[PDB]
Amino acid sequence: SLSNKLTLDKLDVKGKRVVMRVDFNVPMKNNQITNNQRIKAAVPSIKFCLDNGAKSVVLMSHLGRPDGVPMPDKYSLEPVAVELKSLLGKDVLFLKDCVGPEVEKACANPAAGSVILLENLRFHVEEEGKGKDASGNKVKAEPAKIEAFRASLSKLGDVYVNDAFGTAHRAHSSMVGVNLPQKAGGFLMKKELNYFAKALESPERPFLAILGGAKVADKIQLINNMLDKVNEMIIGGGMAFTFLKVLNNMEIGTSLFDEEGAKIVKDLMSKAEKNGVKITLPVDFVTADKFDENAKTGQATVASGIPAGWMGLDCGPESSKKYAEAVTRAKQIVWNGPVGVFEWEAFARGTKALMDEVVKATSRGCITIIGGDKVSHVSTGGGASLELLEGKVLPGVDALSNI
Numbered sequence: 001s002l003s004n005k006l007t008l009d010k011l012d013v014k015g016k017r018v019v020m021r022v023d024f025n026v027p028m029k030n031n032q033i034t035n036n037q038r039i040k041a042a043v044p045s046i047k048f049c050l051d052n053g054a055k056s057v058v059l060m061s062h063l064g065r066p067d068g069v070p071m072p073d074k075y076s077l078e079p080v081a082v083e084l085k086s087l088l089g090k091d092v093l094f095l096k097d098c099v100g101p102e103v104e105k106a107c108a109n110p111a112a113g114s115v116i117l118l119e120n121l122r123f124h125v126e127e128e129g130k131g132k133d134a135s136g137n138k139v140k141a142e143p144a145k146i147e148a149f150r151a152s153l154s155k156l157g158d159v160y161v162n163d164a165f166g167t168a169h170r171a172h173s174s175m176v177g178v179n180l181p182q183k184a185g186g187f188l189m190k191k192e193l194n195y196f197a198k199a200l201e202s203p204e205r206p207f208l209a210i211l212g213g214a215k216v217a218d219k220i221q222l223i224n225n226m227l228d229k230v231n232e233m234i235i236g237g238g239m240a241f242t243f244l245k246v247l248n249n250m251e252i253g254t255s256l257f258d259e260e261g262a263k264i265v266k267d268l269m270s271k272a273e274k275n276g277v278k279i280t281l282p283v284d285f286v287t288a289d290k291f292d293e294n295a296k297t298g299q300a301t302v303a304s305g306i307p308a309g310w311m312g313l314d315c316g317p318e319s320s321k322k323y324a325e326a327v328t329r330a331k332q333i334v335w336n337g338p339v340g341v342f343e344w345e346a347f348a349r350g351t352k353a354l355m356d357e358v359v360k361a362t363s364r365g366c367i368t369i370i371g372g373d374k375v376s377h378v379s380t381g382g383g384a385s386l387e388l389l390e391g392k393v394l395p396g397v398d399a400l401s402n403i
């Protein structure tokens with residue numbers, strides 16, 4: 001819903017300084033970006049600004065959850081700066097803080113065409129407006145300090161842009177408290193909301209949802225809301241053992257069992273049933289002797305049970321084939337969460353096999369949407385997508401200027 005908000009295509013940025021909230025919270029290992037998808041997604045708004053005559057583009061984001069303590073040794077945005085520079089073909093001035101004297105001066109009037117990335121916002125308790133101390137307790141933020149944090153951010157540009165879709169569910173100071181006459185939705189913000197609004201309000205049918213993940217209790221709302229829209233639905237990952245234990249009394253050994261979500265499984269199945277949704281659960285498995293990448297692997301079916309002391313970490317071949325048949329009937333697919341422990345090659349086969357079917361479906365004309373160009377749309381969303389789909393309002397979209 002961006003018919004009534006100001007958006008970038010209309011903002012005149014010529015000779016103007018631009019502050020842009022983006023989502024550069026990327027997955028990392030050992031100070032190394034493991035996935036630069038969130039960085040690439042931000043490129044077209046940045047380019048447009050630079051191309052249209054921007055004095056400067058100042059970029060701000062969080063990374064991980066450092067809970068209002070500075071952690072530049074574990075959670076620094078510096079690695080992103082180096083990545084952004086290559087992608088952009090431009091120099092990137094990395095600043096080691098996000099508010100204050102040094103930052104405001106550095107951004108006061110940069111050389112024409114400067115791209116500037118600030119340090120992790122969540123190094124300041126005032127970004128969330130709450131935090132944890134070094135003894136792990138409930139530290140309250142100070143209103144006067146929040147007003148100062150925000151007022152410092154409002155200095156780094158003449159105009160504001162939110163291209164931060166992956167964070168749009170967060171009412172944080174960088175997301176709703178920036179004070180400037182013009183607050184615009186960037187091109188990503190627009191692309192994301194257009195794909196998910198078309199997918200949900202004029203779906204191509206048959207419409208398939210694939211939902212995977214570890215726990216059930218936290219997806220009740222998602223599943224319910226999806227169950228009113230979709231023609232089919234796959235339920236996969238460690239969340240399916242809860243389902244199979246209740247609907248089939250499968251012996252799951254040490255596989256994950258959501259004791260709470262177990263009590264409403266019945267109601268989900270009942271609403272699916274009355275709505276005519278076909279529920280596709282896994283029927284076989286790759287089992288492991290412990291929660292380890294280098295565990296000993298086995299195999300099991302619903303008929304056979306998983307032996308005791310062993311746990312299920314990936315669906316198997318016959319489950320793969322079942323998933324594929326739903327993929328074949330679909331004209332639209334929304335996929336959220338893995339069907340197994342794809343992190344680990346031994347347990348990655350189900351997700352790979354499945355990605356292939358979804359890719360092949362795209363070639364025939366299926367609209368395929370996956371969570372954060374072989375598919376229609378790879379979302380940066382993940383957690384914000386889930387809230388989009390639970391029907392809830394996005395603090396990041398609501399705070400943009402009205403026309």
Ligand SMILES: Nc1ccn([C@H]2O[C@@H](COP(=O)(O)OP(=O)(O)O)[C@H](O)[C@@H]2O)c(=O)n1
Pocket residue numbers: 212213214215236237238239256312313314336337338339340341342343
């Ligand atoms: N036994 C298990 C354990 C984890 N998982 C997957 O569960 C995913 C995360 O669980 P989650 O529900 O808390 O988060 P999402 O899948 O919604 O992103 C991890 O990426 C694992 O690959 C699984 O499918 N089966």
Ligand SMILES: [Mg+2]
Pocket residue numbers: 215218
């Ligand atoms: Mg969750």
